[PDB]
Write a protein that binds this ligand. Structure first.
Ligand code: ZN
Ligand code: ZN
Lengths: 218, 217
């Protein structure tokens, strides 16, 4: 597959995108973020593979950044593949309590840290994490970046160009619209929503996602 | 999600296996089981060794003898059902080119292989043909004279497909020429089975040319 791409999307916020070859279908992209605070770096979702995680770490360290932590937004592999490698480098890895326990139940590498409430911050205010309820998975969380006004929605949100909800084998479809409404209730002054797959868009990505969820729910 | 097998004609069964793609949804992949009396031939295996196991179980529970498999190209998916069949002493066939491509990539290799651009399997049951590069450099197709079905694998796209699929190893500018070589065989095609998506008519070929020429620009 083609290798990790990293592109600046705001002052101190970079989009990292990994790619998978899907036989029969084509190339599929997966997004996360790197957030900088002076020379400290925080990774929101790892890349989709251990080797693209290695490239992400090298991106940061070649720039003289110290990688302080990762947070993964649910237990699925496009969010967590790199937890094994970061653990091996002694980089703190974080999920929610629920995500950590799901990983453990499945015999997957676990983060070295977790948070218990519906809200938590990383980087002492830099990244606000929120659990809005089930949708894409029972455990999906979102990250709000108050300085850049970026909401990282992960797979709980769908890009404009997405006509469906994606992989729903672990989804709670009938809960999903309510969980997006919970995000809206936070009154974040969102100017960009970053989905787990596809292109970055505005806050109207939330309304789009509600439409898809309500349609599927029937 | 587990294997599905369904009859699409007397003696011909469609097997469809599924992958969970984690930002897109479920992706299906097709192959065939072709019967001559109780003797069964597999055209492409499920992309999983675990689904191939189930396809073999499907055949032998019905009391069929699995005579051979044929693989249409060297991609990770439709092979290493090769590994499994090899282990059960079931002959596995590919083109010689496909065989060497696998061997070069250190993948499991078929025990059997054919040299020319044409080969017939099962006493006239299955006709294999190499039309040129397209989805891949080595892709072959299988023609079934009895049922008048062409298995196009990923060289052909379903009527519903809007793109050529995974094009990483494609010869896009060679692709329309290769479909043309299939048309040039003048097979009395009643159906075409794509590697992905719904089975359809011979117009699936024209559709594929249209995607290929379009892409070529
Ligand atoms: Zn997921
Ligand atoms: Zn292929």
């Amino acid at each position: 597959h083609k290798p990790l791409e990293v592109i600046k999307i705001e002052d101190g916020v970079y989009l990292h995108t990994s790619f998978k070859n899907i036989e029969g279908y084509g190339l599929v992209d997966s997004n996360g973020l790197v957030v900088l605070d002076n020379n400290q770096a925080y990774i929101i979702d790892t890349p989709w593979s251990e080797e693209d995680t290695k490239l992400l770490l090298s991106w940061a360290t070649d720039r003289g950044y110290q990688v302080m932590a990762s947070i993964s937004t649910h237990s699925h592999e496009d969010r967590t593949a790199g937890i094994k490698l970061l653990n091996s480098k002694s980089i703190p890895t974080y999920t929610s309590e629920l995500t950590k326990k799901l990983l453990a139940r499945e015999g997957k590498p676990v983060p070295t840290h977790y948070f218990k409430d519906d809200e938590f911050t990383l980087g002492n205010g830099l990244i606000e994490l929120y659990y809005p309820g089930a949708g894409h998975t029972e455990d999906n969380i979102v990250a709000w970046l108050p300085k850049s006004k970026i909401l990282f929605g992960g797979c709980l949100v769908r890009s404009h160009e997405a006509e469906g909800l994606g992989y729903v084998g672990d989804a709670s479809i009938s809960s999903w619209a309510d969980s997006i409404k919970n995000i809206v209730s936070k009154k974040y002054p969102i100017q960009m929503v970053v989905p787990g797959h596809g292109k970055v868009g505005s806050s109207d990505i939330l309304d789009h996602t509600i439409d898809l969820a309500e349609s599927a729910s029937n």
